[PDB]
Design a protein around this ligand. Structure first.
Ligand code: GGB
Ligand code: GGB
Ligand code: ZN
Ligand code: ZN
Lengths: 371, 371
């Protein structure tokens, strides 16, 4: 099987659909990656994650380096063996969580205090890559410096420039590890805040280094959908067309559809899992709050067109009861349904692009979802 | 299919093994019933409960009458449909929880305040039977008055006598409901605390009324194993031999083995589910606390002879991590393993009795479990 082979089977406007072939499996694009931060997609066995249609999941360098620890995971046989997921895993590099959850920053990297116990740790391009090697992930993210929003052009520029130096260091560290270079892929992260000239400079620097894929970083950090879409409008075309484009930490269903319309191939977000546990279910007519009294005697499934196992077997009324009672099975069923909904959305996106009817799909989807 | 047909296939001493045939399935005895108090066996889908080997689960009249409500469950199609478990369900009558979790007691019944919101409710033999009819349970428990431990002989006698009057009222209420009388079974509950003469009077009263099965009530309420076993020694032989004998709210694996040696056919307890969520796993070498540091790098499964799906797929080290991190999947995996362990114990009990080697099994089991 190939290390990394991206094929585009069809286009419609800026939208693309295709496949990434890797040693542990094929990833159908556009793809949604369930988030499995602490070596679990919360409340789901791996087999259930797969049954929803997911091809790849996300793990987090920052959380796993603290608990259970990267060298421990490697000693236990790697992340895939540890958690029982044998398909591809993408790991974020830690650079965002170190800033959001922990700190001393310099050109070498970041030192920080753990949010679990205040112990001191270090991340750097070289250490992030080494941790991801120890975990055994299939798609490795370059280590970046995250730019707060809003930022002055000058602060966004200096942060982007450091990120680009760290991208080169990440490339070199990855290429020095034969096992990683032979079996994994490395993605670079474009920065530059909302500024077109900086996004261009960042894209140029990343392409000069060369990566297997390119993430648009620094968005979905408080700017709102209109601004995110404006930035994607000019930023995605700057990236190499022939490699996957990954929008990190996005998003709501309508964010996904609009980002695909702008050339994004891959997504991750905690929304389906987190909001499932908190009682929000996604439906083709928009989200519902299952705890609401209107569902107490509703025998319909969460969504009456959903193909998932939850909607084949249990009612809104039952799941309403479970969530109100604090029952673990409520979190399990809501999470399975939401991840399945996201995967069915991605499938409809892929099919509509392949069939040359994605523009109509997006319009039909919005009209109903927001009615 | 029969409403209720109990067959004893084999005996060894006072131990029996056999089957209870009911309309929704066969119950192999001795049987362990996972507890599904609030219309869920905590952290398990019904299909997973079945996959562990369980033939029947327990629901609770007290909890379900408060949330979601008995008439609501009936309007939604009954408890089996509501929760997605299509095999037999036994429901306790509410008489113990009303005293332990809520109260005004009289000959008519009990009035009490809900533990959820302080609202006022009533239970009586007639209302308990009606609630169990609305739920649709397959085995209905008579409504009893629970005797605290310790109790004077005179207080135990007056409580037992009231329970026997309530047993007759339960019988009559059940027999007045054609649907229930045709499709469900009714069990009576022996009382009398630790006193042989009262246990005899209680057994005689229950047999005169006539029930499909007989529970030994009022034990495992603080008296300890030695005293519980002493009382079982004389109490079980007083019950009709040709009907199932049910020990309610028991227990640890060694409690089960000793109770089977004394003629008990059926058990329920929250221990495997509750202690699973709290990090205690049952093994053939005794319980382990999976959170203990000694398991942090242990690649063995929870138990290296267990047949369950958890022990085929995940290590102690992984489950240790999950429970320490507060992850729902930890509770799911620990609970599945513990319920599977209990079912494998019951299977070994059944096979050993059938094969005339239960005495040796019990000795071998204890020697290892307590080594
Ligand atoms: N930047 C890193 N390493 N992770 O991404 C975090 C998600 C955020 N939306 C972003 O795109 O930055
Ligand atoms: N008594 C009723 N209704 N429920 O049983 C509660 C369990 C307790 N061990 C008992 O045997 O009483
Ligand atoms: Zn669904
Ligand atoms: Zn097991």
């Amino acid at each position: 099987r190939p290390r990394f082979s991206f094929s585009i089977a069809a286009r419609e406007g800026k939208a693309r659909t295709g496949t990434i072939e890797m040693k542990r499996g094929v990833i159908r694009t556009p793809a949604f990656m369930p988030v499995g931060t602490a070596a679990t997609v919360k409340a789901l066995k791996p087999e259930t994650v797969r049954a929803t249609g997911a091809d790849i999941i996300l793990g987090n360098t920052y959380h796993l380096m603290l608990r259970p620890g990267a060298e421990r995971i490697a000693k236990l046989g790697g992340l895939h063996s540890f958690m029982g997921w044998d398909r591809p895993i993408l790991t974020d590099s830690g650079g965002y969580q170190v800033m959001s959850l922990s700190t001393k920053q310099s050109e070498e990297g970041v030192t920080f205090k753990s949010h679990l116990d205040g112990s001191r740790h270090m991340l750097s391009p070289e250490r992030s890559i080494e941790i991801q090697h120890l975990l055994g992930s299939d798609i490795v993210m370059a280590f970046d410096e995250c730019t707060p929003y809003p930022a002055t052009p000058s602060r966004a520029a200096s942060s982007m420039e450091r990120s680009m130096r760290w991208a080169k260091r990440s490339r070199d560290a990855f290429d020095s590890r034969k096992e990683q270079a032979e079996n994994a892929a490395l993605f670079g992260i474009q920065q530059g805040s909302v500024f077109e000239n900086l996004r261009q400079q960042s894209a140029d620097a990343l392409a000069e280094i060369g990566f297997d894929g390119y993430a648009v970083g620094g968005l979905a950090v408080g700017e709102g959908q209109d601004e995110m879409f404006r930035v994607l409008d000019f930023s995605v075309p700057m990236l190499p067309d022939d490699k996957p484009h990954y929008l990190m930490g996005v998003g709501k269903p309508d964010d996904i559809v609009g980002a695909v319309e702008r050339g994004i191939d891959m997504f991750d977000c905690v929304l389906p899992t987190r909001s499932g546990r908190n009682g929000q279910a996604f439906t083709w007519d928009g989200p519902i709050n299952i705890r609401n009294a209107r569902f107490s005697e509703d025998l319909k499934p969460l969504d009456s067109e959903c193909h998932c196992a939850v909607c084949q077997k249990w009612s809104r009324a039952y799941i309403h009861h479970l969530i109100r009672a604090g029952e673990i099975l409520g979190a399990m069923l809501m999470t399975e349904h939401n991840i399945a909904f996201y995967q069915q959305l991605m499938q409809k996106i892929r099919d509509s692009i392949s069939e040359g009817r994605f523009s109509q799909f997006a319009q039909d989807f919005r009209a109903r979802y927001f009615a």
